[PDB]
Amino acid sequence: ISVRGLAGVENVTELKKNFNRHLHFTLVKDRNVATPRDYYFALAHTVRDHLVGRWIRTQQHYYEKDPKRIYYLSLEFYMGRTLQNTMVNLALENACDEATYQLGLDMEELEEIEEDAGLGNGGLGRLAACFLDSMATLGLAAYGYGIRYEFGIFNQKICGGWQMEEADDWLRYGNPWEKARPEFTLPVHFYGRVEHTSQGAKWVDTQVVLAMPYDTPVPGYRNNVVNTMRLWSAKAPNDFNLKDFNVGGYIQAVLDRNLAENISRVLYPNDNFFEGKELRLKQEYFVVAATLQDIIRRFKSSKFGCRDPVRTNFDAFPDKVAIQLNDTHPSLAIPELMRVLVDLERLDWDKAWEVTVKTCAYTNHTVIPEALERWPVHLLETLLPRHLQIIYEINQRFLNRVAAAFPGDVDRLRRMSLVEEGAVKRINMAHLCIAGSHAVNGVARIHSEILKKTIFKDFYELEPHKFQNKTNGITPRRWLVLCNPGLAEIIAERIGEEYISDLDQLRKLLSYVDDEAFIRDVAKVKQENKLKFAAYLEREYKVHINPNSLFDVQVKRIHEYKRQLLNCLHVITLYNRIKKEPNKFVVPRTVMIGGKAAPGYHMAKMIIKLITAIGDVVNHDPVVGDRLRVIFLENYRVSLAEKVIPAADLSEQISTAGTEASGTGNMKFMLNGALTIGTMDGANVEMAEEAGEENFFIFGMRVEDVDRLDQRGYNAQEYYDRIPELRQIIEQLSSGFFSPKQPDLFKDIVNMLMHHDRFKVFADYEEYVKCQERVSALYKNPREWTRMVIRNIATSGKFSSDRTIAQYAREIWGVEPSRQRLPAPDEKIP
Amino acid sequence: ISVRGLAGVENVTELKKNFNRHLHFTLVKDRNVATPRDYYFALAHTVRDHLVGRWIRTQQHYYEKDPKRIYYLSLEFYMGRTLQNTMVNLALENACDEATYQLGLDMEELEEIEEDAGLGNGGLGRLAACFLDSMATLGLAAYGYGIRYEFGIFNQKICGGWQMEEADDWLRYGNPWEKARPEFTLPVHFYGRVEHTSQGAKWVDTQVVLAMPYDTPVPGYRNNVVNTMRLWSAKAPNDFNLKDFNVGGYIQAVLDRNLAENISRVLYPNDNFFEGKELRLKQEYFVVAATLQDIIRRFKSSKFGCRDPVRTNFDAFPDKVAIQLNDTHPSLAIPELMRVLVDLERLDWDKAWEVTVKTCAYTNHTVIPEALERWPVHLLETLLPRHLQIIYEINQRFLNRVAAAFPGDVDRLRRMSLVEEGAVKRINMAHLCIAGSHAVNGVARIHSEILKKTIFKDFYELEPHKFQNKTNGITPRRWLVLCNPGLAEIIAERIGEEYISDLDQLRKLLSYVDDEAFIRDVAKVKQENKLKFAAYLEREYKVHINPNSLFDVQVKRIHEYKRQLLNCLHVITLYNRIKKEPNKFVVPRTVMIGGKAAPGYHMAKMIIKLITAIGDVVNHDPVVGDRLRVIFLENYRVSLAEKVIPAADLSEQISTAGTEASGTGNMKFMLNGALTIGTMDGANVEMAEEAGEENFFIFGMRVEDVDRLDQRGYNAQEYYDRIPELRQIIEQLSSGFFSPKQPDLFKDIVNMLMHHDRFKVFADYEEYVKCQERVSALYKNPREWTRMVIRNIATSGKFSSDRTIAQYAREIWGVEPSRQRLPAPDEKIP
Numbered sequence A, B: 001i002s003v004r005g006l007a008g009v010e011n012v013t014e015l016k017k018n019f020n021r022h023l024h025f026t027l028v029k030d031r032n033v034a035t036p037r038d039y040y041f042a043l044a045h046t047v048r049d050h051l052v053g054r055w056i057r058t059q060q061h062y063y064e065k066d067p068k069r070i071y072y073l074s075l076e077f078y079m080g081r082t083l084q085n086t087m088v089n090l091a092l093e094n095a096c097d098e099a100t101y102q103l104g105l106d107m108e109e110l111e112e113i114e115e116d117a118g119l120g121n122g123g124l125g126r127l128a129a130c131f132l133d134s135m136a137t138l139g140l141a142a143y144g145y146g147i148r149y150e151f152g153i154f155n156q157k158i159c160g161g162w163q164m165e166e167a168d169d170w171l172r173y174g175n176p177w178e179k180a181r182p183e184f185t186l187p188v189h190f191y192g193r194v195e196h197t198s199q200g201a202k203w204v205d206t207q208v209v210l211a212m213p214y215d216t217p218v219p220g221y222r223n224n225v226v227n228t229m230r231l232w233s234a235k236a237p238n239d240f241n242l243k244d245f246n247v248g249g250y251i252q253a254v255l256d257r258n259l260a261e262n263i264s265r266v267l268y269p270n271d272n273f274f275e276g277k278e279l280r281l282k283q284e285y286f287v288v289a290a291t292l293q294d295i296i297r298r299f300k301s302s303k304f305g306c307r308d309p310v311r312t313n314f315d316a317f318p319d320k321v322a323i324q325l326n327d328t329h330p331s332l333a334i335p336e337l338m339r340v341l342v343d344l345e346r347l348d349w350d351k352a353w354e355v356t357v358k359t360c361a362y363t364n365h366t367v368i369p370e371a372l373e374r375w376p377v378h379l380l381e382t383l384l385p386r387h388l389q390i391i392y393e394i395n396q397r398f399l400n401r402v403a404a405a406f407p408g409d410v411d412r413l414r415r416m417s418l419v420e421e422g423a424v425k426r427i428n429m430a431h432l433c434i435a436g437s438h439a440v441n442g443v444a445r446i447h448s449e450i451l452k453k454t455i456f457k458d459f460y461e462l463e464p465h466k467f468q469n470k471t472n473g474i475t476p477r478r479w480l481v482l483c484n485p486g487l488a489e490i491i492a493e494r495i496g497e498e499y500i501s502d503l504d505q506l507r508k509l510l511s512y513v514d515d516e517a518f519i520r521d522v523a524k525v526k527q528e529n530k531l532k533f534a535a536y537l538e539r540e541y542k543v544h545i546n547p548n549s550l551f552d553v554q555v556k557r558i559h560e561y562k563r564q565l566l567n568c569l570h571v572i573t574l575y576n577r578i579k580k581e582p583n584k585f586v587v588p589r590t591v592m593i594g595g596k597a598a599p600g601y602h603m604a605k606m607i608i609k610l611i612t613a614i615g616d617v618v619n620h621d622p623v624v625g626d627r628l629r630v631i632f633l634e635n636y637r638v639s640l641a642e643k644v645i646p647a648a649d650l651s652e653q654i655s656t657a658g659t660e661a662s663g664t665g666n667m668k669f670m671l672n673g674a675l676t677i678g679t680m681d682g683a684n685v686e687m688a689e690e691a692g693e694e695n696f697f698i699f700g701m702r703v704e705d706v707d708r709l710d711q712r713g714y715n716a717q718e719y720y721d722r723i724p725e726l727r728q729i730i731e732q733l734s735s736g737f738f739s740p741k742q743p744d745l746f747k748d749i750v751n752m753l754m755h756h757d758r759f760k761v762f763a764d765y766e767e768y769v770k771c772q773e774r775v776s777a778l779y780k781n782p783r784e785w786t787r788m789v790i791r792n793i794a795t796s797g798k799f800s801s802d803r804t805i806a807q808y809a810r811e812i813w814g815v816e817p818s819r820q821r822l823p824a825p826d827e828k829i830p
Ligand SMILES: O=c1[nH]cnc2c1ncn2[C@@H]1O[C@H](COP(=O)(O)O)[C@@H](O)[C@H]1O
Pocket: A056, A059, A060, A063, A298, B030, B032, B033
């Protein structure tokens, strides 16, 4: 059937009876009233059973051996569905497929019932999920820590061409994967005041919120290692949240508990954009305060909570603990760790600071200013008074370091300060992170260099040893084996299976680049994928596409810097050319654009309306026929990504040079047989470098060109004046060609494009359509297109998250990865 | 060990491995980190497994056979713990005891970990729970329908002698008994307006709240019948509760979902008191609207949803459905059933009304005016506009019936109206219930007569056939076998086990009233019970009592009509007499008073402070010694009742004649070996009548005496003037003898007692202490006390809820009870 494992005799029988046990005893249903949703749950519980045994021994193992522990703090974890992934990592897929078949059910149909765990916005959250899978596969004693939002990223609905947001109640029917651990609830403080008494400061008169943990298992790939993802939930105490007496109402006091519990209610739907709301700051401190207590508790036991030197010496803390900060969201971990060490454990400042810097490491993910976290001091002042005092003291000492290294450089001092003066004073969280961590890294080579050269230049000059780079990666398990079993099978047929946890081995495929059978197969699976997606489209969304055309797709969050607008201009150009010479042959294309816009991002929402507006015109023009279709992919998410990517021919990674820190969707497309048209931005550079620029469609300005233009001054009128095809489009938009009933509907887009385009869309227009012509040329030659594809796939190995994690491990965390199978799952009950 | 069933070889082994399965696979723990709480859950899941098989076949059975269905609507269901009860009804107790023992654990210790299901206030809610157990034991196709409050009755804490209320988070650790059924969610409407169009009215522009059901199994006693208790939870729709667009904030819209979900958040802690708050009205309509939809759906399938006459003829509705209204809380069921039949199904008014009256039956529970539900019309008008219109039409037609029967009686018309004019117009829910039901019943003989003679006189004259009586009862399973296995065993030793589901058989014990061994045994178990309770007291609450003294207990909600104050006066009297003649012998007594006061009931809370104030004085007077102890039993609840009642010698049921509709705690004490001192009120009359007044300590005014006094005019000064012992107490209260630091602390109590005592506490004072002297006299003669006890126990059979349900069944519902074992639980999987 494929290498989804063995469908053993004993195990298919065992699976079936357990499927029936759960349907009866767990779901309390009988075959006669059971629905697909019930069947899905019986299977999920049956699969979950197989990894609890491993989960328990893994955790027990780490307790016995006591290795260095990795803590990955992130406010986002974009997990997606987890049934199939679990089957894959446990080699259960074929057995489950068989068993459910014998039970008379379609596993694929059941898999579609599982709700996505959308606890993230985009790249940053998905990176975290890929990292977890890799850390488990490389046998690292690693823990993912976050917030268990009951409402994840909103579900997007397109009404009359506009985006409609609706609550994502992913827990509505339950989550069979998590395991509530109410017994490990912890208290978290807010507000209050600071009392300076005799021997130390005291954080007093605080409001308490309880943090209840929920553990989700993270299975490694076929090595019997099951790590833990601990997500916190906010709960109100039953005392003060009722006990602070003297009139108000007993009922009202019970109803008001949903005020402290609102902390983990909803994820903030902003991607690369900072909103300074108090609720967000609360979520940030919440995950940090609870997580650290758990970290120190585990440390206090270790082998110190037995003997060792005997005396809670936190000198070994950094040798046993490593906490990674995913962006600046969990930045309060630094001042929080100091508060606990200084205020509670009573270490001296300096010893405490040495410990903190040595255990903390920060990852930066963007250079755009509007994404930078600068919290107003009046907020920190009220909500976390002691942390503010600690931050001012960290700043004081740091700045003294600076003054001593750069005597007289008074502007450097203000530029480096953690405190920003002006309208309102703010705290620059990124500066905090750099000062309190022993390593700061970028997510792609160019981005990392940009940090050193630009944004964090002064910091780099002060401590050059802190700055590193760790190019992002993706997991070949979910992003290849899981979503594209067909491609994975034909690869395995030639080079075996060891590449799933050693993607570098994909290079061996280079020697099949002239192989006639392989070229035929690679081209076959991509055609099978396109057919399946074309079907799904009419199945769930309804209104036909042509599977023979080139599948041109751009799926990612809607942003001005990602330039879906630049993609829009090209689509309109194709349309206009066709209308000019109808009877001329052009390569057919189905251009699919999908992505979510943050609720408050007016421009982003205006862009989604434009895309659908273009499709209304293009898709109903009889002269165009089936040569051009413009489709907006609704509710783009992980599970949807797993469907489109394997069906794509062309991947659009056209951000303005120097704005996309890395990107990861780009890597997903590369490993799945799509060719890339893009700019020399983020990881695009390393991908072209790995595959050879001849096998990549690169165009537009490089970072240096962008800066030159800025010195000069960017003027969009010039481009408007010198390109008639461009001029024709802008005037079509301006006159209502795309919005008849509302002729001025797109005035904001045009106005912006002409007068305040921060991302110079026009500057790359000519080179973009010229370059698009070259891919259409190559697509006309099936054999050569597929051969270039094989050059990409065969060369994508460097982009596996296993490689990324192995580097973080050795260069930042100080631990050694290991592909050693944990001693089986075998029963045991001590 | 006792007759807690057989501890079979095969089953103790089977239980153990299943206990281990769950501890591993369900709880995901290993013996080395498992806590008592974990052990409790493993056991609970192991026990729950045994009744799912029966649950499924019972429900399937009712679907096949299609008998008449009973629907018990109640806003309260005071269930208490459910582990032991389940073991008892399944004959699993000894097997579980053995198995857990072999596993090295104490079942009793684990049982103490289960949280009480406090979804009720007192009598009314507990009656509902006892009724469910009985309906299952008598094989009735019955369903309990209510609200799944996430916060039940508050937990009471005594701080400095005052009651402190704190949220009852009973779901904090989970509920292994319920089974969420999100797939059966239903929509419920609120607000909106009525559109009268061509063919009928239309309820339009409503706000929708979703009702999600949760089923809990209700096992009958050893007959393999497992009925269902369906509790609704409020959920916000994800559309409009987000989709009603045009600025407000996306975050705020998601946070505001906890506004529609507040409906099932907390139970209203009022016992026999009406609070006209909008939230309460919402809860009331919520349970009714959801429940009825479920009722009609099941009806539409029946055997009509196949064939029968063919044409949704609701003429057979009453032959297939019976809905019992527990008090007036679910009274909206009447106008709601009309709205669905008339507005949706389009039946004519008259046919619809005939159906409604024939399926609905109402139970009244109190005669005090402040407990009567009179909803302001402006509330109904805004929240349920169509129901108000239907109510006015029901009233219109009813009043026309009245006018036609009593021509010219214009005052009768206003007195009978469902609409009350005055300050604000109100709707008298009780009148609604009488007009729309085919049977109205009281809960004890005297109470029922009082309804006919007083409160509902006019209604009785119009339709005498509607009024009936159904004396309350309690379940011998939880209230005897479960809480007092020792007494149950010695009874079984003489007369067998058939009395557990046939309590009348307890009469056979009369012939052992002179049996020397039996008297010794009955007295032995009561001494063992008192010792165990005396221990528990120091264990969990700490500060000694003497097990040899008489256990004088009064446990029920704190009310002015229940007269804990009258009990207080006697206690102070005993104290004062002792202080007068210290060296005189008196029978030692530990007087235990326990109960919860509604948060807003100032007087009730003042009484709790008095009780503790008396104990502070009495309990620390060296002259008193161990002859008198005053203890306030904290957080009185079902699980606590199961501990004190079996340890009581004297039961206090001293409400003012004509105020306690029935009572049930009284019956609990009678079946457990305590003698009763009380007034001729509620069921007390029938209990004395059953045991013989010679075996009962009756005192005080009868109903007739109370009325005579009211004609005359009650003047408390008289009693104050003529009784020096009484005068001495009032002056002790008045001068701070019981509250040194705050001398005027109890001025409200004294003021009330002297000037506005609605329940004439002073009027029964003399006869009360005189009567208390007679029980002390009898207690001095152990042999005769125990013989009188045997006369009570042997004669309590009439007070089993099996008898009550069998009457409701035959005289109101029109169904025949059956003690037939359902065809085993045996596997099966169709
Ligand atoms: O005190 C202890 N005795 C024995 N095993 C322990 C103890 N503390 C932790 N463990 C084991 O280590 C696992 C790790 O627990 P953690 O504290 O949540 O990381 C637990 O599930 C147990 O298997």
